């Protein structure tokens, strides 16, 4: 049982949020649209909407899509300085997973990280992804403050999932994926906005398998994140999990920044 706290819309210094980013693994764009996903977005009214798993491709009028299955999208009220695709490595750039949108005071990276697979069939490749991804982001962040959002396909610590004991050998909670995430946070460096703000808050998840009635029981995993350069922590107002938004097996997450 979890009730996301009210929206804090001012930074620690009292500056009002000026930027609201929403990110959401929609489990098929067409399906999500049929389940009234776009309606919820219109009410949320973000300045920037990142979407993962669109499986489609080809106040939010600038729209950028990348597809190989998978697929991501990035819809923005204002125009970026520059939009670019992938992470600069042939091998990792074929599955429509990353869009990089550069703005005046920061760079936004939306990602759909490769799952390790049933049986952990793709865990070796996942580790190679993780290492290239962390190198690319460290590159970006050496130049401008970074915001990374999306479905990073890993529950960091035991507090990020409802059943840590039963999932230590399943994709999303292996020691390798968890070490990989701790390494991205250390090396770029990046902080986990939600956990920074709510360090001891249990049962806050953003994904629940469609099977076994898991959402109704709250048997979930936190796989979706907003990770921020440490210099953006003074602009952090809040990082929200919209638990009650329906439309997919993942719920949206929303970030407020005062820039
Ligand atoms: Pb899916």
Summarize the annotated binding site as residue ranges: 25, 53, 151, 153, 249-250
Summarize the annotated binding site for Mg(2+) as residue ranges: 25, 53, 151, 153, 249-250
Cβ–Cβ under 8 Å, residues 206 and 251 = yes
Residue 59 CB-density burial (10 A; 0-12 exposed, 13-18 middle, 19+ buried): exposed
Report the separation in Å between the CA atom of 177 and the middle of ligand 1, taken as the mean of its atom positions. 19
The technique by which this structure was obtained is: X-ray
SS (H, E, C) the chain: CCCCCCCCCECCCCCECCEEEEEEECCCHHHHHHCCHHHHHHHHCCCEEEEECCCCCCCCCEEEEECCCCCEEEEECCCCCEEEECCCCHHHCCCCCEEEEECCCCEEEEEECCCCCHHHCCHHHHHHHHHHHHHHHHHHHHHCCEEEEEECCCCCCHHHECCCHHHCCCCCCCHHHHHHHHHHHHHCCEEEHHHHHCCCCCCCCCECCCHHHHHHHCCCECCEEEEEEHHHHHHEEEEEECCCCCCCCECCEEEEECC
Q: Tell me the C-alpha distance between 234 and 143, whole Å.
A: 18
Report the separation in Å between the CA atom of 252 and the middle of ligand 1, taken as the mean of its atom positions. 14
Q: Which residues are catalytic?
A: 112, 151, 250
- The count of residues in the chain is 259
**CA diameter of the chain:** 49
This structure's resolution (Å) is: 2.0
Task: Sort strands 82-85 and 72-76 into parallel, antiparallel or unpaired.
Answer: unpaired
Q: Tell me the C-alpha distance between 222 and 206, whole Å.
A: 5
Report the separation in Å between the CA atom of 27 and the middle of ligand 1, taken as the mean of its atom positions. 4
Give the C-alpha distances (Å, rounded to integers) separating 13 from 10, 195, 234: 8, 20, 8
Other beta carbons within 10 Å of 127 = 16
Q: Which of 3.20.20.70, 3.60.10.10, 3.40.50.11400, 2.40.70.10 is the CATH number of 1-259?
A: 3.60.10.10
Report the separation in Å between the CA atom of 41 and the middle of ligand 1, taken as the mean of its atom positions. 19
Q: For 173, how many CA atoms within 13 A lie in the half-sphere containing its CB?
A: 18
Q: Tell me the C-alpha distance between 205 and 4, whole Å.
A: 10
Q: What is the distance, to the nearest Å, from the Cα of residue 21 to the centroid of all Cα atoms in its chain?
A: 11
Residue 1 CB-density burial (10 A; 0-12 exposed, 13-18 middle, 19+ buried): exposed
Report the separation in Å between the CA atom of 14 and the middle of ligand 1, taken as the mean of its atom positions. 39
Q: Tell me the C-alpha distance between 135 and 188, whole Å.
A: 8
Q: Domain-by-domain residue ranges, the chain?
A: 1-259
Report the separation in Å between the CA atom of 70 and the middle of ligand 1, taken as the mean of its atom positions. 8
Report the separation in Å between the CA atom of 250 and the middle of ligand 1, taken as the mean of its atom positions. 8
């Amino acid at each position: 049982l979890y009730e996301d706290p009210p929206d804090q819309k001012t930074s620690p210094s009292g500056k009002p949020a000026t930027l609201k980013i929403c990110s959401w693994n929609v489990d098929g764009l067409r399906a999500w649209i049929k389940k009234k996903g776009l309606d919820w977005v219109k009410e949320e009214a973000p300045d920037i909407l990142c979407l993962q798993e669109t499986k489609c491709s080809e106040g939010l009028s600038h729209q950028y899509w990348s597809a190989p299955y998978s697929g991501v999208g990035l819809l923005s009220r204002q125009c970026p300085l520059k939009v670019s695709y992938g992470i600069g490595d042939e091998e990792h750039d074929q599955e429509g997973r990353v869009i990089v949108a550069e703005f005046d005071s920061f760079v936004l990276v939306t990602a759909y990280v490769p799952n390790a697979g049933r049986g952990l069939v793709r865990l070796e490749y996942r580790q190679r992804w993780d290492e290239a991804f962390r190198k690319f982001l460290k590159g970006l962040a050496s130049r401008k403050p970074l915001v990374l959002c999306g479905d990073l396909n890993v529950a960091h610590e035991e507090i990020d999932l409802r059943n840590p004991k039963g999932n230590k050998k399943n994709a999303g909670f292996t020691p390798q994926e968890r070490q990989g995430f701790g390494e991205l946070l250390q090396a770029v460096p990046l902080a986990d906005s939600f956990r920074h703000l709510y360090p001891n808050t249990p049962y806050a998840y953003t994904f629940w398998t469609y099977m076994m009635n898991a959402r109704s029981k709250n048997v979930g995993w936190r796989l979706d994140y907003f990770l921020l350069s440490h210099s953006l922590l003074p602009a952090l107002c809040d990082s929200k999990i919209r638990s009650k938004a329906l439309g997919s097996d993942h719920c949206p997450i929303t970030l407020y920044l005062a820039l």
